């Protein structure tokens, strides 16, 4: 049990670290998805707004 | 060509309105999920403090 605990603790710590890595990667995806949407629909949708004007004339 | 007019406006108005709204609506959902991340950070700190 001491080893099972160290192993479970390794797993708990692993999971805390894995969760930490994923806390970081979820935030990176939360920020990257955010940034990509924020820049991508905001720019390309803006480019389609610009289409409204670009294709006028 | 009433259709060019229908399309020039439908493309812009339907999308800018629906799309920009999704940007800000989700920005708030995302901010709340980011708050959840902060609350998990708080939860982890509190468990350690206890």
């Amino acid at each position: 049990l001491s080893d099972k605990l160290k192993e479970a603790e390794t797993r708990a710590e692993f999971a805390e670290r894995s969760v930490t890595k994923l806390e970081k990667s979820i935030d990176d995806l939360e920020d990257e998805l955010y940034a990509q949407k924020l820049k991508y629909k905001a720019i390309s949708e803006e480019l389609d707004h610009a289409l409204n004007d670009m294709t006028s004339i | 060509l009433n259709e060019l007019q229908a399309l020039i406006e439908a493309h812009f108005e339907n999308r800018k309105k629906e799309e920009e709204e999704l940007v800000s609506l989700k920005d708030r959902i995302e901010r709340r999920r980011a708050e959840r991340a902060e609350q998990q950070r708080i939860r982890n700190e509190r468990e350690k403090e206890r």
Partner: peptide
């Protein structure tokens, strides 16, 4: 930019027709 593929065609027709006339007007002598 289909709006202008279509506007292009309209103006193309307007000029082609004006041009057809420019060419005829000169051709008529």
């Amino acid at each position: 930019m289909d709006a202008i593929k279509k506007k292009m065609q309209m103006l193309k027709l307007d000029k082609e027709n004006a041009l057809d006339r420019a060419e005829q007007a000169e051709a008529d002598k």
